[PDB]
């Protein structure tokens, strides 16, 4: 009936609820394209489905909070990736090799003292 | 001029605070100033007893002052006369019905603050610095301890050229957190100027 995952990216989490259907996608009560209004990135999010010829056999209700649009795009990518294996572990075999099942760890590096921002160091003259 | 305080560095683990009391942005600064004022009269008084630490717990107008010493008797007095006078001097400073426990030190040669004070004294009594040091490091090393180390500042023996005398035995890993190294600093007023003593005592790990 239902299949869950989660997916997190650059500090942005997303609820991914898969269900057998057409290809309808509700993100925070909006059509995928309604939410990702002209952000060339979007397509990516659903990439895990196309990977296993799905999309044309599934439907998805997505809730998302935290971070920013493109970070949410990835959270959804991982949620949908997990939910797909939640429906069938055999999906890993070929879904994994494309990475989809890995959580991107890189996050905003901390701002150190003495620098202008983590690494950018102050400019010095007549040294 | 490097390396952090070995205690402030170890407050997370192997080391607790000397004041355990919650407060809000309206009180904190006060219960603090006071909490200090306490250590003020106390350390200026109980000196001879050899006060190694003064913990201060609070609850609500309740003050659990716990003067730690090597000679718990100088605290008390004749029968119990001092721990009466002072205990009253305290509540006089801050009307807060203050307790005033007293604890003895199971070996004052493992109380970094004391060892510092000891050596710091010998200096004003015009002793040979290096001797004092080597000795202290010995006392500590003898009565247990897995390592120890003493440091004296400069103007040794009234010299115009300030120096710095060493001395140490066994392990004393300042870098390792779970070291549990007691540390103590003793001043040293003089006819010619100030000197500074630092005491390090390494005991146990994990």
């Amino acid at each position: 009936e239902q299949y869950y995952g989660t997916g997190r990216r650059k500090e942005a989490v997303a609820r991914v609820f898969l269900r057998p259907g057409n290809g309808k996608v509700t993100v925070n009560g909006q059509d995928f394209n309604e939410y990702f209004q002209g952000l060339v990135r979007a397509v990516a999010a659903l990439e895990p489905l196309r990977a296993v010829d799905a999309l044309g056999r599934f439907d998805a209700y997505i809730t998302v909070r935290g971070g920013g649009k493109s970070g949410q795009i990835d959270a959804i990518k991982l949620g949908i990736a997990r939910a797909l294996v939640q429906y069938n572990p055999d999906y890993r075999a070929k879904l994994k090799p494309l990475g989809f099942l890995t959580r991107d760890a890189r996050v905003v590096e901390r701002k150190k003292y003495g620098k202008h921002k983590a690494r950018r160091a102050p400019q010095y003259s007549k040294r | 001029g490097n390396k952090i305080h070995p205690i402030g560095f170890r407050l997370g683990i192997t080391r607790d605070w000397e004041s355990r009391w919650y407060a809000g942005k309206k009180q904190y600064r006060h219960l603090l100033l006071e909490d200090q004022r306490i250590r003020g009269l106390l350390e200026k008084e109980l000196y001879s007893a050899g006060l190694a630490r003064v913990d201060i717990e609070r609850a609500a107008d309740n003050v659990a002052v716990t003067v730690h010493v090597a000679k718990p008797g100088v605290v008390i007095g004749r029968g119990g006369e001092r721990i009466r006078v002072l205990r009253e001097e305290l509540a006089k400073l801050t009307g807060k019905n203050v307790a005033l426990n007293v604890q003895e030190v199971q070996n004052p040669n493992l109380s970094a603050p004391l060892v510092a004070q000891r050596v710091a004294e010998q200096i004003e009594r015009r002793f040979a610095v290096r001797r004092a040091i080597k000795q202290a490091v010995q006392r500590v090393m003898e009565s247990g301890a897995k390592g120890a180390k003493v440091i004296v500042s400069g103007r040794i023996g009234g010299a115009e050229q300030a120096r710095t005398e060493w001395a140490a035995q066994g392990r004393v890993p300042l870098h390792t957190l779970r070291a549990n190294i007691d540390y103590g600093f003793a001043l040293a007023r003089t006819t010619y100027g100030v000197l500074g003593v630092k005491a390090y005592i390494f005991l146990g790990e994990v």
Binding site: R110 | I4, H5, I7, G8, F9, L11, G12, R15, D16, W17, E18, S19, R20, W21, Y22, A23, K25, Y28, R29, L32, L33, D35, Q36, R39
Partner: protein
């Protein structure tokens, strides 16, 4: 910290404005914190002693 100037404690400011803080430990007027009534120096010092409850070395 001239003793004469640590008269700041003197409520009587004549005009509430003129009243300013000072380190309650060193008299330092130049960089005193409110939540401690202590300057950045005295503050760093006591924090090391462990005499500032709850205050730890922040890392992240």
């Amino acid at each position: 910290a001239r003793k004469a100037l640590i008269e700041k404690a003197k409520r009587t400011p004549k005009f509430k404005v003129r009243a300013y803080t000072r380190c309650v430990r060193c008299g330092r007027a130049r960089s005193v914190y409110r939540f401690f009534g202590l300057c950045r120096i005295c503050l760093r010092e006591l924090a090391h002693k462990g005499q500032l409850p709850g205050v730890r070395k922040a890392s992240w």
